[PDB]
Chains A and B, each alone.
Chain A
Amino acid sequence: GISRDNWHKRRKTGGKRKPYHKKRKYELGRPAANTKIGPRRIHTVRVRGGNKKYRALRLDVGNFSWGSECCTRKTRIIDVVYNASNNELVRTKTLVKNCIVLIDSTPYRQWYESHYALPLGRKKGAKLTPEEEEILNKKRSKKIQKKYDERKKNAKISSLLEEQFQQGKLLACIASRPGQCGRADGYVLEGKELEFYLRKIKARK
């Protein structure tokens, strides 16, 4: 079927190649796993040596990482916005490695609330939702508030990260191969990487 052999290829000098054998089993290739966004559907393919590969066909959930804070949570994948290989891998919305995706910010935001001791930030319109202000105000002893204050001393979130957190979406990069492991994991874009990919998306649009 699909072959990955090099003896069908022209020589370095450009001369033609005459095969000495027909296609072998160990030189095979398989159709791509165009891992779209949808309810989790993963197919298992048996590979050389009896091992198993996880050919993910549909995924909407991934284990992404917030590298600066070292906070990785299970998050929902919302959209793909940039592909460095082909534009059609964004138009058809396939999950491949090193593709830029939109992920939810709710788990990271909630962990940040469990981190929250910062001064007044963006609390203008308020929320007025009871049993949520416990995680921000609470009742706490003196040394617990001292620890929270010493944590606030080293709290610093980039403006781009804030702007993303307002919209409920975060820019992330798929660092795994969904068509080979069945998992769409990665890390949230930060710093110059985030700036570069934001410029890429802006120039594309």
Chain B
Amino acid sequence: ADIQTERAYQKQPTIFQNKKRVLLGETGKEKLPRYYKNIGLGFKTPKEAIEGTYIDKKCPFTGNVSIRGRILSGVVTKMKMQRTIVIRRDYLHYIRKYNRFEKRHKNMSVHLSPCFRDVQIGDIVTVGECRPLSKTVRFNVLKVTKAAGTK
């Protein structure tokens, strides 16, 4: 489970990992301090974020992003990108002339932190608005709700 899989060293920029230790008081890797924050609006930090080891600069809990703006929801449809998933948001648009609605949808590419493991296609995810993380990504997954049709 190597973390350093890139050409540059991966580490949380806040945590200093070169502090001097004591020889007689150290036997094995003692601890690596973990940087994590609690995002607002009542969202609880997942356990895997606090006690994990992954490095994600776009993670809402262990990264540099701040959640602000719209809190949305959607269902996972594709998981074929690194730390990024595609969710679909279905809604009904009212046509005034016919007094009726039509089904419409929009796909949003949202960032999924490694603190959410075993997220499946069809799960309901709560996303929060953040700064542009890529060309199309502007939302971060904050909570994953398992689908009713799951194990």
Contacts and interface: CB of A to CB of B under 8 A. Distances in A.
Interface of A: 6, 9, 12, 67-69, 84-85, 98, 154, 156, 190-193, 196-197, 200
A191 B4 CA distance: 14
Contacts of A200: 7
Interface string B2-20: 0010111101000011111
B18 A67 contact: yes
B23 interface: yes
Given A9-B135, A12-B135, A12-B136, A156 B7 contact: no
A193 B13 CA distance: 12
Interface of B: 4, 6-9, 11, 16-23, 109, 135-136
A203 B151 CA distance: 46
B18 A196 contact: no
Contact of A197 (B9, B19, B109): B9
A12 B132 CA distance: 14
B18 A190 contact: yes
Given A9-B135, A12-B135, A12-B136, A156 B21 contact: yes
Contacts of B16: 67
A84 B8 CA distance: 5
Given A84-B6, A190-B18, A192-B17, A156 B135 contact: no
A184 to B, nearest CB: 18
A54 B17 CA distance: 32
A191 B18 contact: yes
Given A9-B135, A12-B135, A68 B9 contact: no
B19 A68 contact: yes
Nearest to A12: B136
Nearest to B7: A84
A156 B9 contact: no
B20 A156 contact: yes
Contacts of B135: 6, 9, 12
A140 to B, nearest CB: 25
Given A154-B20, A156-B20, 6 more contacts: A12-B109, A12-B135, A68-B18, A85-B7, A191-B17, A197-B9
